[PDB]
Amino acid sequence: PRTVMVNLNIHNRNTNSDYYNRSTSPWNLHRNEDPERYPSVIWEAKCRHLGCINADGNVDYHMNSVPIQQEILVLRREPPHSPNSFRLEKILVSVGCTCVTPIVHHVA
Amino acid sequence: NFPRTVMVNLNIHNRSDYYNRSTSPWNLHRNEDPERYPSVIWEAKCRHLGCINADGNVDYHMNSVPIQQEILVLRREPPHSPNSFRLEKILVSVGCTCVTPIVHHVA
Numbered sequence A: 001p002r003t004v005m006v007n008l009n010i011h012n013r014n015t016n017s018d019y020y021n022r023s024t025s026p027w028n029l030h031r032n033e034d035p036e037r038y039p040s041v042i043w044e045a046k047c048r049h050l051g052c053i054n055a056d057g058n059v060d061y062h063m064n065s066v067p068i069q070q071e072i073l074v075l076r077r078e079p080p081h082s083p084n085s086f087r088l089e090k091i092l093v094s095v096g097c098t099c100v101t102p103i104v105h106h107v108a
Numbered sequence B: 001n002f003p004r005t006v007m008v009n010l011n012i013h014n015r016s017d018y019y020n021r022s023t024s025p026w027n028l029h030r031n032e033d034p035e036r037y038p039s040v041i042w043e044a045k046c047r048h049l050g051c052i053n054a055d056g057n058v059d060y061h062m063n064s065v066p067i068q069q070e071i072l073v074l075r076r077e078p079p080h081s082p083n084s085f086r087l088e089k090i091l092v093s094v095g096c097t098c099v100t101p102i103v104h105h106v107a
């Protein structure tokens, strides 16, 4: 069906870290708020460095910290400001960072 | 205004070799549930316990750890219902990162 009903009283399902800090590609969380969306608040990861932290605790510029982006669904109020009717909308969220070897190629 | 039941139009409006190039690489595993929307969820599983160093070897002094995110899914309620759901909060692995291990002698 096009329209379905959804009970917003969330049940947790098997939901029972300092990774953001201990990582060689550490990140911080930034609050993204949208009153026309459910969830209204989304926390996005922003990599602290361009390079990665090495064994000596220094930034290695030969490696890159890259955000891992995921495609997430959100509920957008439709019509706008509606408390009880929504449309699914696909957005991209940064969920953390990883350390990668850079893509290399000569200028054409 | 916070109603218990709301209406949702499922016609979505839209608004990557990391898994291999990473020092904490991972593979994707397909999790399928016909009682859930989205029915298919791809989860990351770290390939190694350690991390890949400059020389392409596994460094056992570092750990590959999965990054777990809390996500919401729709579970059919009552079961098998094509048009009614309850929001459910689950934990998914979305990739891996390389961390310096947490060390401690225990009592």
Ligand SMILES: O=C(N[C@H](C(=O)Nc1ncc(CN2C[C@@H](C(F)(F)F)NC2=O)s1)C1CCC(F)(F)CC1)/C(F)=C\C1CC1
Residues within 6 Å of the ligand: A038, A039, A042, A043, A070, A071, A072, A073, A074, A075, A088, A093, B008, B037, B038, B040, B041, B042, B043, B044, B069, B070, B071, B072, B073, B074, B087, B092, B093, B094
């Ligand atoms: O949960 C949030 N949104 C939910 C959502 O997107 N669920 C998803 N499930 C699997 C997905 C695809 N993916 C992502 C990646 C990994 F699962 F690993 F993430 N692998 C995958 O296969 S997307 C919506 C909430 C509204 C709804 F109507 F209930 C439908 C689902 C949301 F908006 C925000 C959460 C970040 C705080």
